[PDB]
């Protein structure tokens, strides 16, 4: 291998995962937001913010750093975030080591200028000697061992569906949804609010509730319906009557209990209401009428399949559907993958689905970081585009 050591920084919409290339597990996983404390004070990291969110001081405002598009928009606080990375966590100068950063798959327009900003963040500000940009669905699909794959990253900003054929990203079929982890945070808050006595600027308390107990609801209480919810009810009664007649119960009425800590209170929900939150990721028309059934992940995948046909279509269809990869932290919820399999097989009944997924709980949260980690230690520099300072010296001229 090469006598090198890379810095691997992943700026997700909710989590920023930073580490080195000589390790498999990151040095730090901090949030992708910051508490402005007010002179100004920008509070960085996991434990420093939550304690500051536990102080509940006025002026403390959580501002996010990566929007729903997966790209940064507040570049000075991102700069100070990376200074916090290289100083407090990584403990290394940014001039010494090469860098590997990530971008989400786009349609083709926003890249270059953000490239320039990456230039203006690595060269003019950090004096990074060289940095590599990898594409996050390409990094996830390639670190698992594929060059043609159908990537479904269910994160906090939404569902990101990306076709990749032989190592190149099919950009017109890259479709980013909006319903993801932060939407489930809002739904869990709005539904449990009459039971917990509750029911930007208060984004300190909103982020604190979404970071302490709503995530605990997501990891323990939520379960994704493997079929459609009404179709689950029909299928489960149809199974249970066969069992009852073969030998001589409603599965929804199973009570799941959540020990809510700020009131020390049992929150009892049946399994249908546990299914109900995850039903809005696939059926967004059940909260409101402004959302089509096309807006959910169900057709949209297939929609992102079909624009890949005009990249001959029916071979691209099988090449994607035999290489489906499901990733993302929000997809760690129980039953997410089987809903993708069933909901994608009902729109393509002809083709056999062979879906692969990294079954490790931790490693699916940091799967884009792991993709950039596999892209960092490549033993040939020609395997990826390494923007040195000469590239931004060339982009300055006219």
């Amino acid at each position: 291998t090469l006598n090198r050591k890379c810095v691997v920084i992943h700026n997700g919409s909710h989590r920023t995962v930073a580490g080195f290339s000589n390790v498999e597990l990151p040095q730090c996983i901090i949030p992708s937001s910051y508490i402005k404390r007010t002179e100004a004070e920008f509070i960085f990291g996991t434990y420093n913010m939550i304690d500051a969110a536990a102080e509940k001081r006025n002026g403390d405002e959580v501002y996010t750093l990566v929007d729903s598009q997966g790209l940064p928009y507040n570049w000075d606080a991102l700069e100070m975030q990376w200074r916090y990375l290289y100083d407090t966590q990584l403990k290394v100068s940014p001039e010494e080591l090469p860098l590997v950063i990530t971008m989400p798959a786009t349609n083709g327009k926003p890249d270059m200028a953000i490239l320039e900003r990456y230039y203006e963040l690595a060269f003019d500000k950090l004096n990074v000697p060289v940095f590599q940009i990898v594409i996050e669905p390409l990094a996830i699909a390639l670190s698992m061992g594929k060059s043609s794959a159908f990537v479904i990253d269910i994160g906090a900003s939404g569902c990101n569906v990306t076709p990749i054929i032989d190592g190149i990203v099919v950009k017109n079929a890259v479709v980013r949804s909006k319903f993801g982890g932060d939407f489930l945070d809002f739904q869990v808050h709005e539904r449990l609010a009459p039971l917990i006595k509750e029911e930007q600027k208060r984004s300190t308390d909103v982020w604190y509730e979404a970071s302490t107990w709503i995530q605990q609801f997501k990891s323990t209480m939520l379960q994704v319906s493997e079929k459609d919810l009404f179709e689950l009810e029909r299928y489960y009664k149809e199974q249970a009557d066969i069992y009852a007649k073969q030998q001589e119960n409603n599965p929804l009425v199973q009570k799941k209990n959540f020990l809510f800590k700020p009131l020390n209170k049992t929150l009892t929900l049946d399994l249908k209401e546990c299914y109900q939150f995850a039903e809005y990721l696939f059926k967004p028309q059940l909260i409101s009428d402004k959302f089509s059934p096309e807006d959910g992940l169900g057709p949209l995948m297939a929609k992102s399949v079909k624009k890949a046909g005009a990249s001959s279509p029916e071979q691209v269809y099988s090449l994607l559907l035999t290489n489906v990869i499901i990733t993302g932290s929000t997809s760690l919820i129980e039953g997410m993958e089987q809903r993708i399999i069933k909901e994608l097989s009902i729109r393509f009944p002809q083709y056999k689905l062979t879906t692969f997924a990294n079954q490790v709980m931790m490693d699916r949260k940091i799967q884009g970081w792991l993709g950039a980690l596999t892209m960092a230690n490549l033993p040939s520099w020609s395997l990826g585009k390494w923007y040195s300072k000469e590239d931004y010296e060339t982009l300055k001229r006219d």
Binding site: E24, L142, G145, K146, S147, D166, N377, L383
Partner: protein
């Protein structure tokens, strides 16, 4: 000519990156398995030191009889 060269370079880049990534996945599994195995061997060292020092304490307890006389 110039087309054969490009197509073969793209195919070699694809196959080589897939090969090295499979190698690093095997490195991941190997390092994790070594961590589990050497931890469980350290537990066996704990058990062996327990048995030896328990035999020592039992002999000294039986032996105190000579001191008592």
């Amino acid at each position: 000519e110039k087309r054969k060269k490009e197509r073969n370079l793209h195919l070699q880049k694809i196959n080589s990156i897939i090969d090295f990534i499979k190698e690093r996945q095997s490195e991941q599994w190997s390092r994790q398995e070594r961590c589990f195995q050497f931890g469980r061997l350290g537990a066996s060292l704990h058990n062996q030191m327990e048995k030896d020092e328990q035999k020592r304490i039992e002999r000294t307890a039986k032996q105190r009889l000579a001191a008592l006389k």
